[PDB]
Amino acid sequence: SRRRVVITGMGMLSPLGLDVPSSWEGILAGRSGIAPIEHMDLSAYSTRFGGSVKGFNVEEYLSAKEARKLDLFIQYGLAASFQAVRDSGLEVTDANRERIGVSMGSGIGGLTNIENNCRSLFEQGPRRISPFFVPGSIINMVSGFLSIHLGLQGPNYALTTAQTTGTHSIGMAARNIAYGEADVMVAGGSEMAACGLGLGGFGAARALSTRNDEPTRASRPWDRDRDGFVLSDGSGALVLEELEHARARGARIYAELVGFGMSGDAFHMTAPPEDGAGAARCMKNALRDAGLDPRQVDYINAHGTSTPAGDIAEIAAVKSVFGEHAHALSMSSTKSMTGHLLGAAGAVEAIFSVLALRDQVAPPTINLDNPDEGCDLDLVAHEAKPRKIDVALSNSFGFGGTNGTLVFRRFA
Amino acid sequence: SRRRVVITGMGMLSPLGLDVPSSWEGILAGRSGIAPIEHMDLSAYSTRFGGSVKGFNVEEYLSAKEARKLDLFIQYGLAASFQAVRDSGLEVTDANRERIGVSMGSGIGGLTNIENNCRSLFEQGPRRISPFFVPGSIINMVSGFLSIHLGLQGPNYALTTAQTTGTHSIGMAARNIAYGEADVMVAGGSEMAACGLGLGGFGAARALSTRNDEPTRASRPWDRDRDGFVLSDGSGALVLEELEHARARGARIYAELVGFGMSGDAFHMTAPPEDGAGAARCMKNALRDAGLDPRQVDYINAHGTSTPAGDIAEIAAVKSVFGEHAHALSMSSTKSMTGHLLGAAGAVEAIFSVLALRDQVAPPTINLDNPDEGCDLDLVAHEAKPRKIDVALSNSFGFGGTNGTLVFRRFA
Ligand SMILES: c1cc(-c2ccc3c(c2)OCO3)n[nH]1
Ligand SMILES: c1cc(-c2ccc3c(c2)OCO3)n[nH]1
Questions:
Q1: Pair A184, A237 in one domain
Q2: Are A147 and B264 inside 8 Å of each other by CB?
Q3: Is B1 inside any structural domain?
Q4: Contact yes or no for A5/A174 (Cβ under 8 A)
Q5: Which candidate, A271, A298, A294, places its Cα nearest to that of A283?
Q6: Which of A357, A273, A267 lies closest to B150, judged by CA?
Q7: Residue to mutate (ligand 2; options B169, B176, B177, B185; most atoms within 8 A of CB)
Q8: What is the DSSP code string of B336-380?
């Protein structure tokens, strides 16, 4: 019968920092992590900036020997997972290793590695494809490599639900624990889609901001002058743990995960419906799961991608779910600062939602100069808002019309 | 307490046929689906054969327009899903669409599309990349396009656990139903990795059979002369349905899904441990989930990839779990005939496991001319074996040491 799930550790790489506290400092100061991309030449691309991880040192985590075989998205996911496990104080033993699993996902996985191996195949033939190509690129290898390195023998899997991946990964891992399949899960996501195919592919869709001349102002969720999402890289990982298991070892508990919701829009492969009907069904599912009155929601970390249709669909969903209470809660998009980490977006934003609870502060939506038609909620424009937060909601929406919602609340 | 889950519809593309009954006829007749790959210069490659889908007609399912937008692995996953839903007789309505979800996975997803868009990018720069590249390639678009086409609004997600994907997809879909989030799930996987990058990537790891002279004899699980797996394409989809929901509409019920187990080896990135300790924990977990004693198992659909290390680990795991019953059950690898459909393997093998129950027959392990050292179990060498099958297991073991086991039982 259903057990309670708490957050005992968190880990992050973001455009704002190489761990959680440095990233969070940036979030509260309204700092942008968006900058012209340096790691390749983008003059032929319509978008030439993004949220890069700056000065990532893989030798903090892994031998250069192991690191050379692994796509950046895996290195990022391992870095966040190691931070989270360390942060939790958990010790893996013969007695508990069968009860500790991992669910680290990605939307696009090792696209850089695939691209580089395609260049080898085309220029030099199949004999120049790396022996490590497959195991070094495929999305489940964060879960695989973490399990091997720490000896985790519990449920081992990976989700890929595009921009919903991080949220789904954390929610479903919570279900493993809640219904007895595990006592501990490392869950979240990682992404490094900043290669020609990624920047080119999203550019071909006309889905990215093309504000090349002012990249820090590009991500402007709900602003009347928004022109698409900013592509960003990184990872979030949380250690989820059964409550009595956490209490028994004297674990520090950041917050409790009380609700998870899933729904499909069944509308369009890439566009959300204008009324946010699927997002609304998903949040209602999460709130019922948490046994909450919707008026208990204090803070929503929006998906808030800075797309014309996405941002307005979220306002409509929130008004539909919360009615007049929509005007009392605070909703912000931290993508205003971080840009869109795709399959890692829900993971880093779940962490920001837990830290909004710990610190009693709504992070800002930066660049919200001229709220668009109907964007008349408290969107925490420009500056962090200290306020009472008992219950925090994190939303994600993705290609295929796939929605996820997490509900966190303070733990007493 | 927990709801019961039954199988009411199945769908498939495999190297043996363009649907379930044609595929199953091939299996019971010991037919091989393996042949030299066509319309592709494989001169430079060490492996020039595999399990192709032959004569697939996507316009039975999709318009020309919508098929041009979707990688083959998506076309395949949609063909199996449409088949399964048609086979179930289910009627989608406004009253039930919120209770119907999708979990169709893939190990690698749209490699063919990635290869073709790489060519455009390298030859002509980013502006020639298809606008539909991303949504036409990413792994969650079978779940996405299926939900949009049929108006399915329930849980929408996608697993990617390499060669375990199809087993995990069905087991986790079964949990959605058992725990009351959905009444129906379409679940399974699809794969089309037979492009240069696929054949080249596995080839560079030297994980494929190079028996180019005798392709139909290449896949030979537990045979002393095996030299790695055979790469195959296709899809499996099952309609999973809550028992009372199926009975209330007079659904034909093929079998009951009674058990799902997961585990991680936490051993190696690509090889299982010698003793199959991980596969053994996973089978014990699935049997405990089903409330069944090992003695009650009659038939096992092995992973049985034809790798030196993998085949012998599964013998060790079955002897460990089953002890004095290990010789009385029948265990066969249908990969002897289909080859290895990677993320779709667990999907088509769950279907073969359900049909072994329906028809009371253990499919053969073909090419098993000379069992290897300690491969002395009933491996159903050469020809199908009619027998009592009340309980059937389907195992998958993948890169990352990720393990899944499904337990099916006869329904009355
Ligand atoms: C568009 C499609 C993809 C893609 C497709 C399949 C995948 C994947 C990435 O990495 C895993 O195998 N990335 N961008
Ligand atoms: C693995 C997944 C689940 C699951 C799935 C869906 C659910 C749920 C539990 O509780 C409410 O909706 N349990 N074990």
A1: yes
A2: yes
A3: no
A4: yes
A5: A294
A6: A267
A7: B176
A8: HHH-B-GGGHHHHHHHHHHHHHHHTEE--BTT-SSB-TT--S---
Cross-strand bridge partners of residue B392? B299, B408
* Residue A280 one-letter amino acid: A
For residue A172 the two structure tokens come to: 């479903």
Nearest to A209 by CA among A87, A119, A335: A335
Phi, psi dihedral angles at B195 (to 5 degrees)? -125, 175
Q: How many domains is chain A built from? A: 2
Is A1 contained in some domain?
A: no
DSSP state of A52: P
Distance A191 CA to ligand 2 centre (A): 26
Same domain, B217 and B288: no
Q: Give me the sheet containing A156-157, strands edge to edge.
A: A156-157, A100-105, A184-191, A234-242, A5-13, A255-264, A402-409, A391-398, A297-301, A330-332
Residues 6 or more apart in contact with residue A353 via CB below 8 angstroms: A299, A301, A392, A393, A394, A406, A408
DSSP string across B97-134: GGGEEEEEE-SS--HHHHHHHHHHHHHH-GGGS-TTTT
Range of the domain at B319: 260-412
Burial A169-200 (b: 16+ CB within 10 A, else e): bbbbbbbbbbeebbbbbbbbbbbbbbbbbbbb
Tokens of A207: 């889905």
Q: Match 């499909």 to its residue by tokens.
A: A264
B246/B357 same-domain check:
no
User: Which residues in chain B precede a discontinuity of more than 2.5 Å between C and N?
Assistant: none
Sign of CA dihedral B367, B373, B378, B379: negative
d(C-alpha B241, C-alpha B218), whole Å: 38
Contact A378, A331 (CB under 8 A): yes
**What length is written for chain B?**
412
Per the DSSP assignment, residues forming a β-bridge with B185 are B101, B240
Q: By C-alpha distance, which of B263, B289, B302 is closest to B396?
A: B302
CB pairs under 8 A between A and B: 277
Alpha helices by DSSP H, listed for B125-242, are: 141-150, 165-178, 196-204
Same domain, B32 and B181: yes
What is the SS3 assignment for B37? coil
For A154, nearest residue in chain B (alpha carbons)? B263
In the block, residue with structure tokens 């089953």: B322
Q: Which of A259, A276, A300 is the last residue of a domain?
A: A259
Rounded CA separation B124/B130 (Å)? 12
Residue at token pair 């979707």: B70
Using the Cα atoms of residue B363, residue B366, residue B372 and residue B376 in order, give the sign of their dihedral.
positive
* Residues B303 and B362 placed together within one structural domain of the fold: yes
As beta bridge partners, residue B398 has: B402
Using CA atoms, how far residue A185 sits from A48, A242, A357, B77, B234, in Å, is: 37, 9, 21, 30, 32
Residue ending a domain, choose from B198, B225, B259: B259
In chain A, the N- to C-terminal Cα span, in Å, equals: 22
Resolution of the model in angstroms: 1.6
- For this PDB entry, the determination method is X-ray
Q: How many residues can be counted in chain A? A: 412
**Residue A139 CA: which ligand 1 atom is closest?**
11
CA pair distance A111, B42, nearest whole angstrom = 24
Question: How many other CB atoms are there within 10 angstroms of residue B248's CB atom?
Answer: 10
Task: Name every chain B residue with its beta carbon within 8 A of the beta carbon of A398.
Answer: 140
B266 vs A contacts (CB less than 8 Å)? 97, 147-148, 150-153
Token pair in block for residue A196: 């020609």
CA dist list (Å): B260 to A93, A118, B99, B163: 25, 38, 21, 16
Strand residues in B142-284 grouped as ranges (E): 156-157, 184-191, 234-242, 255-264
**What gap in Å lies between CA A302 and CA A287, rounded to an integer?**
15
